[PDB]
Design a protein around this ligand. Structure first.
Ligand SMILES: *[C@@H]1O[C@H](CO)[C@@H](O)[C@H](O)[C@H]1NC(C)=O
Ligand SMILES: *[C@@H]1O[C@H](CO)[C@@H](O)[C@H](O)[C@H]1NC(C)=O
Lengths: 38, 49
């Protein structure tokens, strides 16, 4: 039986930071992936 | 008249190595070859917008 393969979940990870002078809170952004996947 | 392009981002570890962990240790021996490429791609992506 033919099994279709699919590469693993990978993409660009960008950190949205407003500058260390204002605050240290950051936000991650996983590019090209759905929110159901980590 | 064209004003914008396709914002293309190229991952070096997925393009050169792909799925090999033995070759990933050899990319760190060359220095910042991937950093210049990522910075140029980010600059092109910002310049398009
Ligand atoms: C934040 O910016 C101000 C003005 O440029 C500067 O005086 C201060 O040292 C900076 N704070 C940090 C933590 O770099
Ligand atoms: C993520 O998955 C949901 C459920 O299948 C789908 O509706 C949605 O379009 C997906 N996101 C993207 C960006 O395709």
């Amino acid at each position: 039986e033919i099994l279709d393969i699919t590469p693993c979940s990978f993409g660009g990870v960008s950190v949205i930071t407003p500058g260390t002078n204002t605050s240290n809170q950051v936000a991650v952004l996983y590019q090209g992936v759905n929110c159901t996947e980590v | 008249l064209p004003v914008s392009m396709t914002k293309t981002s190229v991952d070096c570890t997925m393009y050169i190595c792909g799925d090999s962990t033995e070759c990933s240790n050899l990319l760190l021996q060359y220095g910042s070859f991937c950093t210049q490429l990522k910075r140029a791609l980010t600059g092109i992506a910002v310049e398009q917008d």
